[PDB]
Amino acid sequence: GQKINPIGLRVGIIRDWEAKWYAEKDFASLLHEDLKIRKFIDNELKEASVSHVEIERAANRINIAIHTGKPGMVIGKGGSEIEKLRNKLNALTDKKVHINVIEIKKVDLDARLVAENIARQLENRASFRRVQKQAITRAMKLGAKGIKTQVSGRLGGADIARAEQYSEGTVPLHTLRADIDYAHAEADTTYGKLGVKVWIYR
Amino acid sequence: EFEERVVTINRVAKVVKGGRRFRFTALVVVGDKNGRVGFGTGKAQEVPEAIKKAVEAAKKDLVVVPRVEGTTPHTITGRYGSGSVFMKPAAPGTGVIAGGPVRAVLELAGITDILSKSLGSNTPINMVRATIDGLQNLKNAEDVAKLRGKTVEELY
Amino acid sequence: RFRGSNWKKSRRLGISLSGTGKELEKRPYAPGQHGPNQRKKLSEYGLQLREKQKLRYLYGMTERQFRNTFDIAGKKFGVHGENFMILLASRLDAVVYSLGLARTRRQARQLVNHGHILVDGKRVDIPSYSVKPGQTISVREKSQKLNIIVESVEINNFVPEYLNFDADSLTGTFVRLPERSELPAEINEQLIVEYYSR
RNA sequence: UACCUAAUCAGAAAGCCACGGCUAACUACGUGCCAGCAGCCGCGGUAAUACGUAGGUGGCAAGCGUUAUCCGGAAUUAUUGGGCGUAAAGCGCGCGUAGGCGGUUUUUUAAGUCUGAUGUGAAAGCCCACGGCUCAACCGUGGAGGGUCAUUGGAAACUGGA
């Protein structure tokens, strides 16, 4: 059961890439600055509702746009953190080309917002199935499918590793255009290093 | 409208090719909220769709249980399988308690004057089959009067 | 007479009728061992034995000591089914549960000395008193005004039938005929009217 | 020197058992096929709260585990409570009256079903009540009162035998 859902070759007609820039010599350098600016925005995002990235630095228009779901206090009360982001990006290198924001329609479509309401109780080793049976029905009301509760070992609070087969729905992967979210994310809260086999789909 | 008693949902740890198939056999009493017993077992992945599955496929296994004047017409038994039962009469204006076997047999017969009896074992698959064996073997007032074929007040 | 906790009467039995709130701070689920599991269904003979155990914690006299109680609720002519609730209210706990001395039955059995006892003449320090048409279950001359006898004199306004109680008196001498349906109805009647017979 | 409300000194309902249970019942240590536990279960070759100590818990009642003796258990020489085959059941014995028992119409003189001498109708008997001993043994009612002691002499077209 290594169902990884090869989306890499599945996307490319609707789901391109987050970073876009015309390069080949500045590619590695541009990619080096991409992760360099991602080491400060990830600590400022505080696990925000970010679906994709709008880093379109092609045609001399470099801008590290961050979705961050709905504009809350992340940008500051009236863009008060946008002026403080200048030095933030100025401390890294010398970019700071006015990063923009994007209003994400249907915020509960990624596997981050669904893991912040049904997988947020797993941090205190609590409900990991009762609350994991929910949200998929809410995702069905939105128009999509949702996530599928799954595990390979350490089932909730137990010293004995146990698997599962609670797949509420299937996942289409026989097509070469199928669009799948597949937003993987784990947290090490004094539990140990382990991998899960959770399956998601648009 | 219908007193459906869903006792439990027996699960099974299938050890077939698949990692661990989950088959919930939702158990629910198919009572008509009057005096019939009713018993049906499902085998669907959805308990709600499985509980009604046995209620729409097994709803003719009930038996009409009449009442004299608020007391069991006859103290019947139950010799079907291991688990057995017994019909104990009580006053019309009384009640029931907890501690023993199944509770969805005399509770369906809204009379509050019958004591549900079933020793046998804990297995709830051969203990409810003996309850319908005695319910169908119950002796009524006229039912026994026809057996002799004389008068109702000539066989007591 | 049980010499134990008086809080397991509403856990092992299904008819306590001794206190208003008891499952408010407790756990009203099933039994003790499998308290977090499901409940069961009282058996034919079990329901008649559960009521006996339920009345075992309620009535002061236990197995063999309540001979008269069971003997008056069986051979005695009349509604045999409701004979366990009719010929069983002739105890000394009824007077304390009708005048306003003790809210419980165990405390009412110990209220035959601290509270009103002198029933218009010869008294009795037992759990049952011979209160008939002519007996006035009152207090003594030295124990005229007690603390447990005049405790809830104004706290217990509503009184029961066939009972009398006033201020600085608490002497019961009303009707001698009581009601056979003026008690809690949770146990079976014919079941105990047949099982007892055996 | 009963029940006893009285002097009102302070004279103590503890207990042993199952505890994963069956069957209302447990936590830590110590054990680790050594020993224990040990009706039913079984638990002991390592994580036996089943073991032994401590804190305990369910039960019941001045105590508790034990030994031999009826019946709940359940019909189990079946009687309500047995087949005439796998169950609990094919005498291979083909030829013969054990009086156990197998249509004979009509037909009989009364084997018979429900009436009749009744006085008697008593009883460590269930007496319809009947006396109190608080927890114990405090006993009169022969007609009532059944536990009487009117059930044909009798109405024949009829087990096996015409």
What is d(CA A35, CA A44) in angstroms, rounded to the nearest whole number?
A: 14
Sequence letter at residue C24:
L
Beta partners for residue C137, in sequence order: C119, C172
Is C133 within 8 Å of C119 (Cβ atoms)? Answer: no
Structure tokens at A123: 């941090």
Burial annotation A175-200 (CB, 10 A radius, 16+ → b, else e)? eeebebbbbeeeeeeeeeeeeeebbb
Is A130 within 8 Å of A149 (Cβ atoms)? Answer: no
Cβ–Cβ below 8 Å for A163 and B19: yes
What is d(CA C166, CA A134) in angstroms, rounded to the nearest whole number?
A: 64
Residue found under tokens 């055996």: C198
Chain A CB contacts of B18 under 8 Å are 165
What is d(CA B122, CA C40) in angstroms, rounded to the nearest whole number?
A: 11
Interface of C with B in 91-120 (CB under 8 A): none
Chain B CB contacts of A1 under 8 Å are 19
Structure tokens at C128: 């049952």
Chain B CB contacts of C43 under 8 Å are 99-101, 115-119
Query: What is the spatial distance, in angstroms and rounded to an integer, between the CA atom of B144 and the C1' atom of D147?
Result: 34
Q: Which nucleotides of D are covered by protein (CB under 7 A)?
A: 3-7, 13-14, 21-22, 24-26, 57-62, 74, 126, 134
What is d(CA C92, CA A77) in angstroms, rounded to the nearest whole number?
A: 77
Secondary structure string (H, E, C) spanning chain A: CCCCCCCCCCCCCCCCCCEECCCCCHHHHHHHHHHHHHHHHHHHHCCCCCCCEEEECCCCCCCEEECCCCCCCCCCCCCCCCCCHHHHHHHHCCCCCCCCECCCCCCCCCCCCCCCCCCCCCCCCCCCCCCCCCCHHHHHHHCCCEEECCCCCCCCCCCCCCCCCCCCCCCCCCCCCCCCCCCCCCCCCCCCCCCCCCEEEC
**Phi-psi domain of B133 (left: phi exceeds 0; alpha: psi -120 through 50; beta: other):** alpha
Residue found under tokens 């308290």: C35
Cβ–Cβ below 8 Å for C41 and B113: no
Interface of B with A in 1-30 (CB under 8 A): 18-22
Annotated resolution, angstroms: 2.9
Residue found under tokens 């009580």: B90
C-alpha distance from residue A178 to each of A12, A183, A201, C2, C173 (Å): 10, 15, 9, 75, 91
Choose from C37, C48, C187, C190 for mutation: most chain B CBs within 10 A: C190
Give me the residue from B93, B98, B115 closest to C44, CB to CB: B115
Contacts of B45-53 with C-beta under 8 Å, sequence gap 24+, read B47/B9, B50/B24, B50/B25, B50/B26, B51/B4, B51/B6, B51/B26
Q: How was this structure determined?
A: cryo-EM
What is d(CA A192, CA C40) in angstroms, rounded to the nearest whole number?
A: 43
Half-sphere exposure of A90 (CA within 13 A, CB side): 7
CA A6 to chain CA mean position, Å: 17
Closest residue in chain B to residue C195, using alpha carbons only: B88
Structure tokens at C188: 């079976």
Could you tell me the sign of the dihedral formed by the alpha carbons of B91, B97, B102, B103, in that order? positive
Cβ–Cβ below 8 Å for B86 and C44: yes
Secondary structure string (H, E, C) spanning B84-151: CCEEEECCCCCCCCCCCCCCCCCCCCCCCCEEEECCCCCCCCCCHHHHHHHHCCCCCHHHHHHHHCCC
